[PDB]
C-alpha positions as semicolon CSV with decimal commas, in nm:
position;residue;x (nm);y (nm);z (nm)
1;P;-0,771;-3,333;2,095
2;E;-0,485;-3,366;1,848
3;H;-0,738;-3,473;1,585
4;Y;-0,965;-3,165;1,590
5;I;-0,786;-2,871;1,762
6;K;-0,586;-2,602;1,588
7;H;-0,232;-2,547;1,703
8;P;-0,210;-2,217;1,893
9;L;0,087;-1,990;1,839
10;Q;0,276;-1,830;2,125
11;N;0,155;-1,493;1,996
12;R;-0,133;-1,338;1,806
13;W;0,002;-1,173;1,490
14;A;-0,128;-0,900;1,258
15;L;-0,034;-0,868;0,892
16;W;-0,032;-0,520;0,738
17;F;-0,021;-0,400;0,378
18;F;0,121;-0,076;0,242
19;K;0,039;0,063;-0,102
20;N;0,219;0,379;-0,203
21;D;-0,029;0,639;-0,322
22;K;0,099;0,995;-0,334
23;S;-0,256;1,122;-0,288
24;K;-0,232;1,015;0,078
25;T;0,000;1,051;0,375
26;W;0,231;0,761;0,456
27;Q;0,023;0,648;0,755
28;A;-0,301;0,660;0,557
29;N;-0,146;0,411;0,311
30;L;-0,090;0,154;0,588
31;R;-0,384;-0,082;0,643
32;L;-0,436;-0,386;0,862
33;I;-0,524;-0,693;0,653
34;S;-0,612;-0,955;0,914
35;K;-0,499;-1,124;1,235
36;F;-0,425;-1,485;1,325
37;D;-0,304;-1,683;1,623
38;T;-0,280;-2,049;1,507
39;V;-0,062;-2,243;1,264
40;E;-0,366;-2,328;1,051
41;D;-0,488;-1,969;1,024
42;F;-0,136;-1,851;0,938
43;W;-0,114;-2,089;0,643
44;A;-0,468;-2,009;0,525
45;L;-0,375;-1,639;0,513
46;Y;-0,032;-1,700;0,356
47;N;-0,171;-1,918;0,075
48;H;-0,437;-1,650;0,008
49;I;-0,215;-1,347;-0,049
50;Q;0,030;-1,241;-0,321
51;L;0,392;-1,341;-0,297
52;S;0,609;-1,040;-0,218
53;S;0,788;-1,073;-0,553
54;N;0,451;-1,019;-0,726
55;L;0,354;-0,693;-0,554
56;M;0,388;-0,364;-0,740
57;P;0,691;-0,148;-0,648
58;G;0,620;0,076;-0,351
59;C;0,429;-0,188;-0,151
60;D;0,511;-0,344;0,189
61;Y;0,395;-0,642;0,390
62;S;0,438;-0,609;0,768
63;L;0,381;-0,886;1,023
64;F;0,375;-0,758;1,382
65;K;0,266;-0,881;1,722
66;D;-0,094;-0,787;1,803
67;G;-0,107;-0,438;1,946
68;I;0,214;-0,315;1,777
69;E;0,170;-0,096;1,468
70;P;0,448;-0,126;1,202
71;M;0,579;0,229;1,244
72;W;0,861;0,403;1,430
73;E;0,621;0,600;1,648
74;D;0,473;0,298;1,825
75;E;0,568;0,276;2,192
76;K;0,741;-0,059;2,133
77;N;0,929;0,075;1,825
78;K;1,056;0,415;1,955
79;R;1,373;0,280;2,120
80;G;1,429;-0,013;1,882
81;G;1,577;-0,086;1,544
82;R;1,596;-0,340;1,265
83;W;1,815;-0,619;1,131
84;L;1,820;-0,522;0,764
85;I;1,864;-0,749;0,460
86;T;1,919;-0,569;0,127
87;L;1,841;-0,747;-0,201
88;N;1,943;-0,636;-0,548
89;K;1,704;-0,674;-0,841
90;Q;1,842;-1,018;-0,926
91;Q;1,765;-1,129;-0,568
92;R;1,395;-1,042;-0,599
93;R;1,381;-1,343;-0,831
94;S;1,607;-1,577;-0,634
95;D;1,565;-1,491;-0,265
96;L;1,289;-1,242;-0,178
97;D;0,996;-1,482;-0,130
98;R;1,199;-1,757;0,038
99;F;1,377;-1,513;0,273
100;W;1,042;-1,352;0,357
101;L;0,881;-1,688;0,436
102;E;1,173;-1,788;0,661
103;T;1,138;-1,449;0,836
104;L;0,766;-1,517;0,894
105;L;0,846;-1,860;1,040
106;C;1,122;-1,716;1,261
107;L;0,861;-1,475;1,401
108;I;0,558;-1,698;1,467
109;G;0,778;-1,991;1,567
110;E;0,970;-1,779;1,820
111;S;1,305;-1,902;1,688
112;F;1,517;-1,658;1,896
113;D;1,503;-1,853;2,225
114;D;1,467;-1,623;2,530
115;Y;1,508;-1,312;2,313
116;S;1,191;-1,365;2,107
117;D;1,018;-1,123;2,345
118;D;1,248;-0,849;2,211
119;V;1,106;-0,910;1,862
120;C;0,830;-0,673;1,748
121;G;0,773;-0,781;1,388
122;A;0,915;-0,777;1,038
123;V;0,882;-0,574;0,715
124;V;0,944;-0,649;0,348
125;N;0,973;-0,341;0,124
126;V;0,934;-0,399;-0,250
127;R;1,107;-0,124;-0,449
128;A;1,243;-0,074;-0,801
129;K;1,580;0,033;-0,659
130;G;1,609;-0,276;-0,438
131;D;1,392;-0,473;-0,200
132;K;1,446;-0,495;0,176
133;I;1,353;-0,737;0,452
134;A;1,394;-0,638;0,814
135;I;1,321;-0,774;1,160
136;W;1,227;-0,503;1,407
137;T;1,326;-0,540;1,774
138;T;1,208;-0,327;2,064
139;E;1,531;-0,195;2,223
140;C;1,833;-0,083;2,019
141;E;2,053;-0,061;2,332
142;N;1,987;-0,427;2,430
143;R;2,320;-0,546;2,292
144;D;2,284;-0,910;2,398
145;A;1,931;-0,951;2,258
146;V;2,008;-0,779;1,927
147;T;2,330;-0,970;1,857
148;H;2,166;-1,306;1,929
149;I;1,868;-1,227;1,708
150;G;2,119;-1,124;1,441
151;R;2,320;-1,447;1,445
152;V;2,014;-1,673;1,448
153;Y;1,844;-1,473;1,172
154;K;2,157;-1,473;0,955
155;E;2,205;-1,849;0,979
156;R;1,832;-1,915;0,929
157;L;1,857;-1,734;0,595
158;G;2,171;-1,927;0,504
159;L;2,375;-1,614;0,442
160;P;2,746;-1,705;0,412
161;P;3,018;-1,550;0,631
162;K;3,122;-1,354;0,321
163;I;2,808;-1,145;0,378
164;V;2,758;-0,905;0,667
165;I;2,429;-0,758;0,785
166;G;2,373;-0,445;0,991
167;Y;2,135;-0,333;1,266
168;Q;2,007;0,025;1,242
169;S;1,818;0,224;1,506
170;H;1,482;0,368;1,406
171;A;1,580;0,696;1,568
172;D;1,872;0,700;1,323
173;T;1,643;0,610;1,032
174;A;1,371;0,861;1,130
175;T;1,616;1,153;1,128
176;K;1,699;1,057;0,766
177;T;2,596;0,604;1,349
178;K;2,425;0,402;1,076
179;N;2,496;0,043;1,186
180;R;2,502;-0,016;1,561
181;F;2,573;-0,389;1,525
182;V;2,689;-0,621;1,246
183;V;2,691;-1,000;1,237
């Protein structure tokens, strides 16, 4: 079977695209692109789509587990939060696409050991002020899951100890205690 079978992933994933258009509400600008659940179909989709550094400002990619929409209001996002990476304009050139790819692999490869089930998905926001990459988890009060996801994520990106990243609750973000956790 190793010669002809695709390699199934532990989860089915959905990639979303956001295009800012002020003619529409925020939710109406969010659209599902396609779904995949094997290694081969992931790479066929990835090689087909623009790199994040090539999207126009105001666009997002979101990769989330099937059945979870990339918004605060989803049942699996209400009580959760995000591990947030902030990139200056220089870092769009040097780190955005490679950090985003590593994030994608952390997701579909379930790199967070027993706490991968706490992972909902990830978002990259391309903006003129500064891009952002985030991993969304399902429970902001789950201290032991969040911290472990934070340490693995940080070392998988190669961020040095001189850098610190923060975890923010969506309830805090949606009301417009900033960082609950830092690693």
